[PDB]
């Protein structure tokens, strides 16, 4: 089959285990078996599905070049499915508490599911650990038998820690560090030391890095038996730095993507994030605008954000984008070269990953 | 050492590596590492330890009886605070998240740790996020060569995945399960027919008895390599039947206990939770006193819960309590003499579980 219609069958496969589970083992009832499926459709299905699908692709160029009887390819594609699966479930898990977490409104042109008439956050909190309870569920069934189930676990795990330290410094990041006190309300920053691009780069790997694009080439390889043909520094190296831009990306449609194609309004500027739009424009700014900035920036009044955009039209960041743009090609090119050293094929995979990404 | 000198000795060393990897390889700062290590100690310490106490001393009874080297004897032990602090700190998950949840005001005398003044919500939901990440990292760090890792892990995630199905039971249980649709507010009964014996027990039974009876049991075992020395059945069996009449307990408490004692302000009532108290009593009382529980129960006025109270205790449920409790002694007697036929050490150490519990 085209991969994206094996993937989407897997779901359904994926989701029928699930309930049934509920249903065998759970004592749950049928009204909220339904419940839950509507939430699992809501939270994981309508996107682009690029995570989940990094992960077939990854397997799909190793099949390609290694011999295996019919039904070893049949497994290894259903695995990857299964794989990219978990880190969907495991996304549809980060989004849902932090669209709570963040007062969101929108996302993907709908609401937010904290936001649902008959959910609240009472129970959204609840379904988002549920969410990441049912990657789990389906890594223990369906990889039971499978030899790479302990390293694939192991990597699961060190990712998700590493994306909920993320999140912590993202919602931390317009405070001044010495000034972090659980006893304390916390103020924003008025110097904005910290919005450094050494600081902003920590934030990004962390917050994003690690499950968008390390967990799911890493994952490819694992279900491929494919792990130890490739140098893994280099596809740490690669990850964080795709991973790094496709956050860039994100952080300038926030501020200028119209609100009918983002599926959402941005609040980034309101909510004093260090972006790399505040990063970059402190970067080039002369004592005024850095005045102007922080007397606008981090306020709800609809006249201050619009001060802070037009610093940012004034200031021409689309050149600093475009130069950061094309130091990003430069190194990816570089490492891919690198990889092809030990594998042509994962290298090749690896071009399609940034390629989808650079032209987004 | 006494069990409970060695079980705080390994909190610090938990903490400290927990912490140490933060620095070494998460980038952290010393400002965010004591907001986290602040966390840790708010979230984690102050109980009483029932449930990872649970794991050492089962672990303890064994010892009593095994060969060991004294070097084995002083892992097995470490391995048993290590699990028992898993739990413990599995728990710190629950309790931030559901006090969210739940929006409550206090718990154990202190303010929940969403409303420390420098924490909030956007920050408390990552934290017991965080919490419940810790106890795989130390699983992983500490049991890393164990022979008992897999099955540990795997009970671990089973047992978590019960607790959270268990919230959804819980949350969910004043309202009529035909009206469950997320496209809709969710209305109280009217009616309360879903507020019955069985129904109650599938809510006690999935949203504690999983984490506070069966794993550290069962952990106890494993850390052991004793778990094929016992009928797995009974343990369930006896752990779902103690973990019963804990909560049991807490229902009333709850409702009868003063709040200096209680540590907060009971609201189940104002909730229109499906309390043992509102089970029992519609299991006895006449068609006034149904009418008027209807009139009254779930509603925040303090006139309409004193009424309930009043119902509750007009209709002398101290009396189904005493019958409850005599009960729940014998069976639990009958399953610790049916554990004592392949294993007697083990019957005494659930015998121990259930003096603490019974004479709490
Ligand atoms: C309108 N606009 C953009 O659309 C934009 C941008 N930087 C990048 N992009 C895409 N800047 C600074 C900007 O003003
Ligand atoms: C005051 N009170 C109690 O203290 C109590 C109780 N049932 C159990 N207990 C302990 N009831 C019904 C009660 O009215």
Same mark, same amino acid.
């Given at each position: 089959?085209?991969?994206?219609?094996?993937?989407?069958?897997?779901?359904?496969?994926?989701?029928?285990?699930?309930?049934?589970?509920?249903?065998?083992?759970?004592?749950?009832?049928?009204?909220?078996?339904?419940?839950?499926?509507?939430?699992?459709?809501?939270?994981?299905?309508?996107?682009?599905?690029?995570?989940?699908?990094?992960?077939?692709?990854?397997?799909?160029?190793?099949?390609?070049?290694?011999?295996?009887?019919?039904?070893?390819?049949?497994?290894?594609?259903?695995?990857?499915?299964?794989?990219?699966?978990?880190?969907?479930?495991?996304?549809?898990?980060?989004?849902?508490?932090?669209?709570?977490?963040?007062?969101?409104?929108?996302?993907?042109?709908?609401?937010?599911?904290?936001?649902?008439?008959?959910?609240?956050?009472?129970?959204?909190?609840?379904?988002?650990?549920?969410?990441?309870?049912?990657?789990?569920?389906?890594?223990?069934?369906?990889?039971?038998?499978?030899?790479?189930?302990?390293?694939?676990?192991?990597?699961?795990?060190?990712?998700?820690?590493?994306?909920?330290?993320?999140?912590?410094?993202?919602?931390?990041?317009?405070?001044?560090?010495?000034?972090?006190?659980?006893?304390?309300?916390?103020?924003?920053?008025?110097?904005?030391?910290?919005?450094?691009?050494?600081?902003?780069?920590?934030?990004?790997?962390?917050?994003?890095?690690?499950?968008?694009?390390?967990?799911?080439?890493?994952?490819?390889?694992?279900?491929?038996?494919?792990?130890?043909?490739?140098?893994?520094?280099?596809?740490?190296?690669?990850?964080?730095?795709?991973?790094?831009?496709?956050?860039?990306?994100?952080?300038?449609?926030?501020?200028?993507?119209?609100?009918?194609?983002?599926?959402?309004?941005?609040?980034?500027?309101?909510?004093?994030?260090?972006?790399?739009?505040?990063?970059?424009?402190?970067?080039?700014?002369?004592?005024?605008?850095?005045?102007?900035? *922080? /007397? =606008?920036?981090?306020?709800?009044?609809? +006249?201050?954000? %619009?001060? &802070?955009? #037009?610093?940012?039209? *004034? /200031? =021409?960041?689309?050149?600093?984008?475009? +130069?950061?743009? %094309?130091? &990003?090609? #430069?190194?990816?090119?570089?490492?891919?070269?690198?990889?092809?050293?030990?594998?042509?094929?994962?290298?090749?995979?690896?071009?399609?990953?940034?390629?989808?990404?650079?032209?987004?």
């Amino acid at each position: 089959m085209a991969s994206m219609e094996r993937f989407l069958s897997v779901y359904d496969e994926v989701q029928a285990f699930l309930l049934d589970q509920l249903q065998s083992k759970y004592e749950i009832d049928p009204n909220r078996a339904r419940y839950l499926r509507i939430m699992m459709d809501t939270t994981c299905l309508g996107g682009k599905y690029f995570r989940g699908m990094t992960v077939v692709n990854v397997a799909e160029g190793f099949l390609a070049v290694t011999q295996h009887d019919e039904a070893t390819k049949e497994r290894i594609l259903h695995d990857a499915c299964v794989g990219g699966w978990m880190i969907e479930f495991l996304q549809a898990h980060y989004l849902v508490e932090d669209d709570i977490m963040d007062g969101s409104v929108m996302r993907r042109g709908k609401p937010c599911w904290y936001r649902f008439p008959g959910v609240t956050t009472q129970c959204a909190i609840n379904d988002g650990i549920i969410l990441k309870s049912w990657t789990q569920i389906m890594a223990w069934h369906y990889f039971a038998d499978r030899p790479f189930l302990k390293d694939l676990l192991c990597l699961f795990q060190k990712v998700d820690y590493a994306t909920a330290v993320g999140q912590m410094y993202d919602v931390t990041s317009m405070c001044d560090s010495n000034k972090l006190d659980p006893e304390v309300a916390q103020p924003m920053t008025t110097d904005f030391a910290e919005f450094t691009p050494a600081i902003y780069k920590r934030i990004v790997k962390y917050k994003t890095t690690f499950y968008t694009y390390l967990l799911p080439l890493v994952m490819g390889l694992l279900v491929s038996e494919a792990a130890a043909s490739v140098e893994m520094n280099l596809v740490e190296r690669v990850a964080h730095l795709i991973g790094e831009y496709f956050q860039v990306q994100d952080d300038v449609m926030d501020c200028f993507t119209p609100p009918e194609q983002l599926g959402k309004v941005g609040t980034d500027i309101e909510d004093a994030k260090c972006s790399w739009l505040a990063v970059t424009f402190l970067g080039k700014a002369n004592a005024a605008q850095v005045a102007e900035f *922080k /007397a =606008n920036y981090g306020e709800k009044d609809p +006249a201050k954000v %619009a001060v &802070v955009k #037009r610093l940012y039209s *004034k /200031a =021409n960041l689309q050149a600093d984008f475009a +130069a950061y743009e %094309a130091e &990003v090609v #430069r190194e990816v090119e570089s490492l891919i070269e690198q990889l092809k050293v030990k594998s042509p094929t994962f290298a090749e995979s690896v071009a399609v990953v940034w390629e989808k990404t650079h032209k987004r």
